[PDB]
Amino acid sequence: RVDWPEIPLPTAETADFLPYEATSAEATLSALQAWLADPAETRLAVVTGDCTEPGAAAIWGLVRSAQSEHPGRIVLADLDDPAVLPAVVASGEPQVRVRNGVASVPRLTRVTPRQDARPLDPEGTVLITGGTGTLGALTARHLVTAHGVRHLVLVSRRGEAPELQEELTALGASVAIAACDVADRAQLEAVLRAIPAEHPLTAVIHTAGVLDDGVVTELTPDRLATVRRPKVDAARLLDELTREADLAAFVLFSSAAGVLGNPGQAGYAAANAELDALARQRNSLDLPAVSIAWGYWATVSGMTEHLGDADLRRNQRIGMSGLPADEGMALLDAAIATGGTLVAAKFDVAALRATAKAGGPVPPLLRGLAPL
């Protein structure tokens, strides 16, 4: 979980920085590319709003990956007061949140699951976005077998998986796979009407999306919206049209990039963090919701297919390991039970601990797990 323990700001009067208050996910990318074009090296102090907002998190995720691309050069400050910005830059942390005079930074802490989520209805219906994707396909096998789901609506752009259709129906699950894009206003509403009344919708699981990983200097706002729409606009439409639905759980598949920040994934991290912050709004409003910043999946899926061996070591550098289907899906059950925004991934504590002790640069979020 993203934890924000209290740490003191440095006793500094000024810093050599370029202040800027972030406004939108596309605006930060445009401003950042302008600053990245400057040969002069002044750390870009990006001021962002309350990260619990979807927009601020998306900007946070966008800068998080950007700071992974250019460490020690972009300051992702969440300040209600630009006066602490010189102090924030002088702290050395790329991401500092200062409220009422005290500072805080994102930290990763282990989550204690709670078994108080409302039980899934054995006669209910579960909605999955991008069902034809393997991650959506993986969820279908576990839901019917473990959770005993007898009614599914697997929604994907192509929306036809006969090989999953026969497999899921062979176990007794009334799986209604229809061609639909969740973010589409007309498509989602009609399919949401296709959910039977005697089998009311009980769970929304978001796994649809596109991957357009690229560095900040090469990303474009269209790639932001192209990735965001089946993830951000899709989940927003899910909460909009299913807030009145009988949802026992609200599952959103985020990525570790959206929380930690992974190089060359500014847009994807923006979508994932905005995906999380939407759930936090849902969770705060007492509706059950879970957004999971999933790690590097071991199994090859329709989403994470393009992660090669170079990305394998890039992932394994920060402690990532191939997330198994069982381990990943077992984490989902606790994540649904726990609720809120959580990160379910496998980390190499010893490698991070050894790297921290040896002197390597440990990410601040990982610094909670392996401090000095």
Coordinates of C-alpha atoms in Angstrom, one line a residue:
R1 CA 0.0 0.0 0.0
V2 CA 1.1 3.6 -0.7
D3 CA 2.0 4.9 2.8
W4 CA 2.9 8.5 3.6
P5 CA 4.9 8.5 6.8
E6 CA 5.9 11.9 8.2
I7 CA 9.4 13.1 7.5
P8 CA 10.9 16.6 8.2
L9 CA 11.5 19.1 5.4
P10 CA 15.1 20.3 5.2
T11 CA 15.9 23.7 6.7
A12 CA 16.6 25.3 3.4
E13 CA 15.7 28.8 2.2
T14 CA 15.7 28.3 -1.6
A15 CA 16.6 25.9 -4.3
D16 CA 17.7 26.1 -8.0
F17 CA 14.4 24.8 -9.5
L18 CA 11.8 25.7 -12.1
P19 CA 8.4 25.8 -10.3
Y20 CA 5.3 24.6 -12.0
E21 CA 1.8 23.6 -10.8
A22 CA 0.4 20.7 -12.7
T23 CA -3.1 21.0 -14.1
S24 CA -3.9 18.0 -16.4
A25 CA -2.3 14.7 -17.5
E26 CA -1.7 16.1 -21.0
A27 CA -0.6 19.5 -19.7
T28 CA 2.2 18.0 -17.6
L29 CA 3.5 16.0 -20.6
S30 CA 3.5 19.1 -22.8
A31 CA 5.2 21.2 -20.1
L32 CA 7.7 18.4 -19.2
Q33 CA 8.8 18.0 -22.8
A34 CA 9.4 21.7 -23.0
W35 CA 11.6 21.6 -19.9
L36 CA 13.3 18.4 -21.0
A37 CA 14.3 20.2 -24.2
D38 CA 16.4 22.7 -22.1
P39 CA 20.1 21.8 -21.8
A40 CA 20.2 23.8 -18.6
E41 CA 19.8 21.4 -15.6
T42 CA 17.3 22.8 -13.1
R43 CA 15.1 20.2 -11.4
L44 CA 11.5 20.6 -12.6
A45 CA 9.4 21.1 -9.4
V46 CA 6.0 19.9 -10.6
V47 CA 3.3 20.8 -8.0
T48 CA 0.3 18.6 -8.1
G49 CA -3.1 18.5 -6.4
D50 CA -4.4 16.0 -3.9
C51 CA -3.2 12.6 -5.3
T52 CA -6.4 10.9 -4.2
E53 CA -8.0 12.8 -7.2
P54 CA -7.9 10.9 -10.4
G55 CA -6.3 13.8 -12.3
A56 CA -3.6 14.4 -9.7
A57 CA -2.7 10.7 -9.6
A58 CA -2.6 10.5 -13.4
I59 CA -0.2 13.4 -13.4
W60 CA 1.6 11.8 -10.5
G61 CA 1.8 8.5 -12.4
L62 CA 2.9 10.4 -15.5
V63 CA 5.7 12.1 -13.6
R64 CA 6.5 8.9 -11.6
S65 CA 7.5 7.1 -14.8
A66 CA 9.1 10.4 -16.0
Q67 CA 11.2 10.5 -12.8
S68 CA 12.1 6.9 -13.4
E69 CA 13.3 8.0 -16.8
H70 CA 15.1 11.1 -15.5
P71 CA 15.9 10.7 -11.8
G72 CA 17.1 13.6 -9.7
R73 CA 15.6 16.0 -12.3
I74 CA 11.8 16.1 -11.8
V75 CA 10.2 17.0 -8.4
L76 CA 6.7 15.5 -8.1
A77 CA 5.5 17.7 -5.2
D78 CA 2.0 17.5 -3.8
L79 CA 1.8 20.9 -2.1
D80 CA -1.1 23.2 -1.1
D81 CA 1.6 25.9 -0.7
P82 CA 4.4 26.7 -3.2
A83 CA 6.5 28.2 -0.3
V84 CA 7.6 24.8 0.8
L85 CA 8.5 23.9 -2.8
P86 CA 12.2 25.1 -2.4
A87 CA 12.3 23.0 0.8
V88 CA 10.6 20.1 -1.1
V89 CA 13.3 20.2 -3.8
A90 CA 16.0 20.4 -1.2
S91 CA 14.8 17.2 0.4
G92 CA 16.1 15.2 -2.5
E93 CA 13.0 13.1 -2.8
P94 CA 11.4 13.3 -6.3
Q95 CA 7.9 13.0 -4.7
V96 CA 7.2 15.0 -1.5
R97 CA 3.7 15.8 -0.2
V98 CA 3.6 18.7 2.3
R99 CA 0.4 19.5 4.2
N100 CA 0.0 21.9 7.1
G101 CA 3.7 22.4 7.4
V102 CA 4.9 18.8 7.5
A103 CA 6.2 16.6 4.8
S104 CA 5.4 13.1 3.6
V105 CA 6.6 10.7 0.9
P106 CA 5.0 7.6 -0.7
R107 CA 6.1 4.4 1.0
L108 CA 5.2 0.8 0.4
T109 CA 4.0 -1.1 3.5
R110 CA 2.6 -4.6 3.7
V111 CA -1.2 -4.8 3.8
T112 CA -3.2 -6.8 6.4
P113 CA -6.2 -8.3 4.6
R114 CA -9.7 -7.9 6.1
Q115 CA -12.3 -10.5 5.5
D116 CA -15.3 -8.1 5.7
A117 CA -16.1 -7.5 2.1
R118 CA -19.7 -8.3 1.2
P119 CA -20.0 -11.9 0.1
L120 CA -20.3 -12.5 -3.7
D121 CA -23.8 -13.6 -4.6
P122 CA -23.8 -17.3 -5.8
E123 CA -26.7 -16.3 -8.1
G124 CA -25.2 -13.0 -9.1
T125 CA -23.3 -11.8 -12.2
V126 CA -19.7 -10.6 -12.5
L127 CA -18.7 -8.1 -15.1
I128 CA -15.2 -8.4 -16.7
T129 CA -13.7 -5.8 -19.1
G130 CA -11.4 -7.2 -21.7
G131 CA -12.6 -10.7 -21.1
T132 CA -11.0 -12.1 -24.2
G133 CA -7.7 -10.9 -22.7
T134 CA -5.9 -13.7 -20.8
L135 CA -6.0 -11.7 -17.5
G136 CA -9.7 -11.5 -18.0
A137 CA -9.7 -15.1 -19.1
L138 CA -7.6 -16.0 -16.0
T139 CA -10.2 -14.3 -13.8
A140 CA -13.0 -16.3 -15.4
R141 CA -11.4 -19.6 -14.5
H142 CA -10.9 -18.6 -10.9
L143 CA -14.3 -17.0 -10.5
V144 CA -16.3 -20.0 -11.7
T145 CA -14.1 -22.5 -9.9
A146 CA -13.2 -20.8 -6.6
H147 CA -15.8 -18.1 -6.2
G148 CA -18.5 -20.2 -7.9
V149 CA -19.6 -17.6 -10.4
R150 CA -22.6 -19.0 -12.4
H151 CA -23.2 -15.8 -14.4
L152 CA -20.6 -13.8 -16.2
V153 CA -20.6 -10.9 -18.7
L154 CA -17.1 -10.9 -20.3
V155 CA -16.9 -7.5 -22.2
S156 CA -14.1 -6.8 -24.7
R157 CA -13.8 -4.8 -27.9
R158 CA -14.0 -8.0 -30.0
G159 CA -16.2 -9.5 -27.4
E160 CA -16.2 -13.2 -28.6
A161 CA -14.2 -15.9 -26.9
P162 CA -15.8 -19.2 -27.9
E163 CA -13.0 -21.3 -26.5
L164 CA -13.6 -19.5 -23.1
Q165 CA -17.4 -19.6 -23.8
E166 CA -17.5 -23.4 -24.0
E167 CA -15.0 -23.9 -21.1
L168 CA -17.0 -21.5 -18.8
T169 CA -20.4 -22.9 -19.8
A170 CA -19.1 -26.5 -19.3
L171 CA -18.8 -25.7 -15.6
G172 CA -22.3 -24.3 -15.4
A173 CA -21.6 -20.6 -15.6
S174 CA -24.1 -18.5 -17.6
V175 CA -21.4 -16.4 -19.3
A176 CA -22.8 -13.7 -21.5
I177 CA -19.9 -12.6 -23.8
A178 CA -20.9 -9.7 -26.0
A179 CA -18.9 -7.4 -28.3
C180 CA -18.6 -4.1 -26.4
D181 CA -16.1 -1.4 -25.4
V182 CA -16.7 -0.4 -21.8
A183 CA -15.6 3.2 -22.3
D184 CA -18.1 3.6 -25.1
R185 CA -21.2 5.2 -23.7
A186 CA -23.6 3.3 -26.0
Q187 CA -21.9 0.0 -25.9
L188 CA -21.5 -0.3 -22.1
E189 CA -25.1 0.7 -21.4
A190 CA -26.7 -1.8 -23.7
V191 CA -24.6 -4.7 -22.5
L192 CA -25.2 -3.6 -18.9
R193 CA -28.9 -4.0 -19.8
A194 CA -28.0 -7.5 -21.1
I195 CA -27.2 -8.6 -17.5
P196 CA -30.2 -10.6 -16.3
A197 CA -32.4 -9.3 -13.5
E198 CA -32.7 -12.7 -11.8
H199 CA -28.9 -12.8 -12.0
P200 CA -28.1 -9.2 -11.0
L201 CA -24.6 -7.8 -11.5
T202 CA -22.5 -8.3 -8.4
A203 CA -18.9 -7.6 -9.4
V204 CA -17.1 -5.3 -11.9
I205 CA -13.6 -6.4 -12.9
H206 CA -11.7 -4.1 -15.2
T207 CA -8.9 -5.6 -17.3
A208 CA -9.5 -4.0 -20.8
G209 CA -7.0 -1.6 -22.2
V210 CA -4.2 -1.0 -24.7
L211 CA -0.4 -0.7 -24.1
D212 CA 1.5 2.1 -25.8
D213 CA 4.7 2.2 -23.6
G214 CA 7.1 5.0 -24.5
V215 CA 9.3 7.6 -23.1
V216 CA 8.1 11.2 -22.2
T217 CA 10.0 12.8 -25.1
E218 CA 8.3 10.4 -27.5
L219 CA 4.8 10.0 -26.0
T220 CA 1.9 12.1 -27.2
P221 CA -1.4 13.1 -25.7
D222 CA -3.2 10.7 -28.1
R223 CA -1.3 7.8 -26.6
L224 CA -2.4 9.1 -23.2
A225 CA -6.1 9.0 -24.1
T226 CA -5.8 5.8 -26.2
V227 CA -4.4 4.0 -23.2
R228 CA -6.6 5.9 -20.7
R229 CA -10.0 5.5 -22.4
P230 CA -10.3 1.7 -22.1
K231 CA -8.9 2.0 -18.5
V232 CA -9.8 5.4 -17.1
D233 CA -12.9 6.4 -19.2
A234 CA -14.0 2.7 -19.0
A235 CA -13.7 2.5 -15.2
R236 CA -15.4 5.9 -14.8
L237 CA -18.3 4.7 -16.9
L238 CA -18.4 1.5 -14.9
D239 CA -18.8 3.5 -11.6
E240 CA -21.2 5.8 -13.3
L241 CA -23.6 3.2 -14.7
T242 CA -23.2 0.6 -12.0
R243 CA -23.2 2.7 -8.8
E244 CA -26.9 1.8 -8.7
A245 CA -26.1 -1.8 -9.6
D246 CA -25.9 -4.5 -6.9
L247 CA -22.1 -4.6 -6.9
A248 CA -20.4 -6.6 -4.2
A249 CA -17.0 -5.7 -5.5
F250 CA -15.4 -3.2 -7.9
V251 CA -12.1 -4.6 -9.3
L252 CA -9.7 -2.5 -11.4
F253 CA -6.5 -3.9 -12.8
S254 CA -3.8 -1.4 -12.3
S255 CA 0.0 -1.8 -12.9
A256 CA 3.0 -1.3 -10.7
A257 CA 4.1 1.4 -13.1
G258 CA 1.1 3.5 -12.1
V259 CA 2.4 3.5 -8.5
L260 CA 6.1 3.1 -8.6
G261 CA 6.8 4.7 -12.0
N262 CA 8.5 2.7 -14.7
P263 CA 10.7 4.2 -17.4
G264 CA 9.1 4.6 -20.8
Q265 CA 5.6 4.2 -19.4
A266 CA 4.5 7.7 -18.5
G267 CA 1.1 7.3 -20.2
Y268 CA 0.5 3.9 -18.9
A269 CA 1.4 4.9 -15.3
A270 CA -0.9 8.0 -15.8
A271 CA -3.8 5.7 -16.7
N272 CA -3.1 3.2 -13.9
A273 CA -2.8 5.9 -11.2
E274 CA -5.9 7.6 -12.4
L275 CA -7.5 4.2 -12.3
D276 CA -6.5 3.8 -8.6
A277 CA -7.6 7.3 -7.5
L278 CA -11.0 6.7 -9.0
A279 CA -11.4 3.6 -6.8
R280 CA -10.2 5.6 -3.8
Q281 CA -13.1 8.0 -4.5
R282 CA -15.4 5.0 -4.7
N283 CA -13.9 3.5 -1.6
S284 CA -14.2 6.8 0.3
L285 CA -17.9 7.0 -0.7
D286 CA -18.5 3.7 1.1
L287 CA -19.0 1.7 -2.1
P288 CA -16.7 -1.4 -2.1
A289 CA -13.9 -1.0 -4.7
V290 CA -10.5 -2.4 -5.2
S291 CA -7.8 -1.2 -7.6
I292 CA -4.7 -3.5 -7.8
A293 CA -1.4 -2.2 -9.2
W294 CA -0.5 -5.6 -10.6
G295 CA 3.2 -6.5 -11.1
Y296 CA 5.0 -8.3 -13.9
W297 CA 2.7 -11.3 -14.7
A298 CA 4.6 -14.5 -15.4
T299 CA 2.0 -15.8 -17.8
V300 CA 1.9 -14.3 -21.3
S301 CA -1.4 -12.3 -21.7
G302 CA -3.1 -10.1 -24.2
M303 CA -2.0 -7.0 -22.2
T304 CA 1.6 -7.7 -21.0
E305 CA 2.7 -9.6 -24.1
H306 CA 5.3 -7.0 -25.2
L307 CA 7.5 -7.2 -22.1
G308 CA 10.7 -8.8 -23.3
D309 CA 13.8 -10.2 -21.6
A310 CA 15.2 -6.6 -21.4
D311 CA 12.0 -5.7 -19.6
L312 CA 12.4 -8.9 -17.6
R313 CA 15.7 -7.7 -16.1
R314 CA 14.4 -4.2 -16.0
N315 CA 11.4 -5.5 -13.9
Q316 CA 13.6 -7.9 -11.9
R317 CA 16.0 -5.0 -11.2
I318 CA 13.4 -3.3 -8.9
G319 CA 12.6 -6.7 -7.4
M320 CA 9.8 -7.8 -9.7
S321 CA 9.4 -11.4 -10.5
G322 CA 7.0 -13.3 -12.8
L323 CA 3.7 -13.2 -11.1
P324 CA 2.1 -16.6 -11.3
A325 CA -1.6 -17.0 -12.1
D326 CA -2.3 -18.7 -8.8
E327 CA -0.4 -16.2 -6.8
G328 CA -1.8 -13.3 -8.8
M329 CA -5.4 -14.5 -8.5
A330 CA -5.0 -15.4 -4.8
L331 CA -3.9 -11.9 -4.2
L332 CA -7.0 -10.7 -6.0
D333 CA -9.2 -12.6 -3.5
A334 CA -7.6 -10.8 -0.5
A335 CA -7.6 -7.5 -2.5
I336 CA -11.3 -7.8 -3.1
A337 CA -11.7 -8.7 0.6
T338 CA -9.3 -5.9 1.7
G339 CA -10.7 -3.3 -0.7
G340 CA -9.2 0.1 -1.4
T341 CA -6.2 0.7 -3.6
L342 CA -3.5 -1.9 -3.1
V343 CA -0.4 -3.2 -4.9
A344 CA -0.3 -7.0 -5.3
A345 CA 3.2 -8.0 -6.6
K346 CA 6.2 -10.0 -5.7
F347 CA 9.3 -8.0 -4.6
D348 CA 12.9 -9.0 -3.9
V349 CA 13.3 -7.7 -0.4
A350 CA 16.8 -9.1 0.0
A351 CA 18.0 -7.7 -3.4
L352 CA 16.6 -4.3 -2.5
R353 CA 18.0 -4.6 1.0
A354 CA 21.4 -5.7 -0.4
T355 CA 21.3 -2.9 -2.9
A356 CA 20.4 -0.3 -0.2
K357 CA 23.2 -1.6 2.0
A358 CA 25.7 -1.6 -0.8
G359 CA 24.6 1.9 -1.8
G360 CA 22.4 1.5 -4.9
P361 CA 19.5 3.9 -5.6
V362 CA 16.5 2.4 -3.9
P363 CA 13.2 4.0 -5.0
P364 CA 11.5 6.0 -2.2
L365 CA 8.4 3.8 -2.4
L366 CA 10.6 0.8 -2.0
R367 CA 12.6 2.6 0.6
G368 CA 9.9 1.7 3.2
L369 CA 10.5 -2.0 2.6
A370 CA 14.3 -1.7 2.5
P371 CA 15.4 1.4 4.4
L372 CA 18.8 2.4 5.7

